[PDB]
Design an enzyme around this catalytic site. Structure first.
Site: not given
Ligand SMILES: *[C@H]1C=C(C(=O)[O-])C[C@@H](O)[C@@H]1O
Ligand SMILES: *[C@H]1C=C(C(=O)[O-])C[C@@H](O)[C@@H]1O
Lengths: 253, 253
Positions: B87, B144, B171
């Protein structure tokens, strides 16, 4: 493939969205006072919201203000707009006079753009547009809905009609009743921008909820965004200075 | 009303979206060099992307960094994240070390939040989640997609799995391939927020095209946004000082 709207040193429809700052004084002293504070300010176009001017029914006094205003703004693009009651204005006037005000003011050679309301009609629109192009004045055909956000298809349909009417810049402002309505406005804006638009368009989702629509024009398609000096000319506009920093931040992202 | 996630003086899910900045240094000196720069900065949470740390396979050394890091950001919330190669990570590690790293660090009482990847499997997640809550550490269950933006329903579905797997903060970050994909992210985000959310959620559309999703979480529902210090840890990050002003500006709107 799309046409741009050039007004002096400013090219609407290219690069970062252009900031327009309204002048909303009720009298010559305040209007001039307003214009003086904006001369060396960071902005692209100034809109004179003449519907606020108290002696707006007296054409000579409107010209007198216009002369003095151009003297202080010299080469800053100037949009002239009488916003009618049906679309958020406060001063009621005849439709025959709305035409005369716009024609006489267009005839001065002092305004670079003029706003004409869609609902006002083909009769009113065709005469104002034909006469504005005579003097190389660019025309915004505008439509506002303060209660609802029409469906995307309906929004696109209005922007298209405005285009058929010869609008150099179709403009539509809508009111969201929910968050999704804001996205519907953005959705219609980009569909217009990518598939149906033939020139630059101006769109906004009003109130605090739709403020994002005033900032993201560079990605979504709105070529111009309105920012306020001291007080708001439409619900949701933020100060033009903060709008400038946000647009710049997004230009390099 | 619904749940909020409290980490020290920061209340996630209330008022302004919270600003999280990542530290991405490769060695101890650099990591501390970054921490001192974020110590009294206008940010809410600091994220340690430990996957960037070269000596990450030695828990002892990872812990030595935490102890020194705390001495600087003792009162600031600290999220511990090992972003796997799959990811967007830059360092390969066995799935068994991934678990032990997260458990051992979470056991130190020095981290306030930890990020576990949804696609890492329920085995890994239940194990880490359980242990984390036992140390009173908040858990971000993340996902992600650097290739595309799944359909709205899928995004909401993932956010829902995350809640059911016990995340304090669900998230998702997705990649838009068009402007419409950016609106899909926002739409999915708002749907979770009003209909299915029991906790605050974190969402973003990556790249320059999606940058607008990092700025309007207050309206659409994302409770945390990521800003860059010196450089980005994900495509489309804005500098955190700039981000702070835009969020404060939109909060009062
Ligand atoms: C999770 C999401 C991010 C983003 O899209 O800005 C960056 C990463 O550092 C995070 O862990
Ligand atoms: C058109 C639209 C405006 C807005 O929504 O901000 C401002 C008015 O002053 C313009 O005439």
């Amino acid at each position: 493939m799309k046409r741009k709207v050039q007004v002096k040193n400013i090219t609407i429809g290219e690069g970062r969205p252009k900031i327009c700052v309204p002048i909303i004084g009720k009298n010559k002293k305040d209007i001039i006072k307003e214009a003086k504070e904006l001369k060396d300010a960071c902005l692209d176009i100034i809109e004179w919201r003449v519907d606020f001017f108290e002696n707006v029914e007296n054409i000579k006094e409107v010209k007198e203000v216009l002369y003095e205003l151009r003297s202080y703004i010299h080469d800053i693009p100037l949009l002239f707009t009488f916003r009618s009651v049906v679309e958020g204005g406060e001063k009621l006037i005849s439709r025959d006079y709305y035409t005369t005000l716009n024609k006489e003011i267009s005839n001065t050679g002092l305004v670079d753009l003029i706003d004409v309301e869609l609902f006002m009609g083909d009769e009113v629109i065709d005469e104002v547009v034909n006469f504005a192009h005579k003097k190389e004045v660019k025309v915004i055909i505008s439509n506002h809905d303060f209660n609802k956000t029409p469906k995307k298809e309906e929004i696109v349909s209005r922007l298209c009609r405005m285009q058929e009417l010869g609008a150099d810049l179709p403009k539509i402002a809508v009111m969201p009743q929910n968050e999704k309505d804001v996205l519907v406005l953005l959705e219609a804006t980009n569909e217009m921008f990518k598939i149906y638009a033939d020139r630059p368009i101006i769109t906004m989702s009003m109130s605090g909820m739709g403020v994002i629509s005033r900032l993201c024009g560079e990605i979504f398609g709105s070529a111009l965004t309105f920012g306020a000096a001291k007080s708001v000319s439409a619900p949701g506009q933020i100060s033009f200075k903060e709008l400038n920093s946000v647009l710049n931040l997004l230009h390099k992202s």
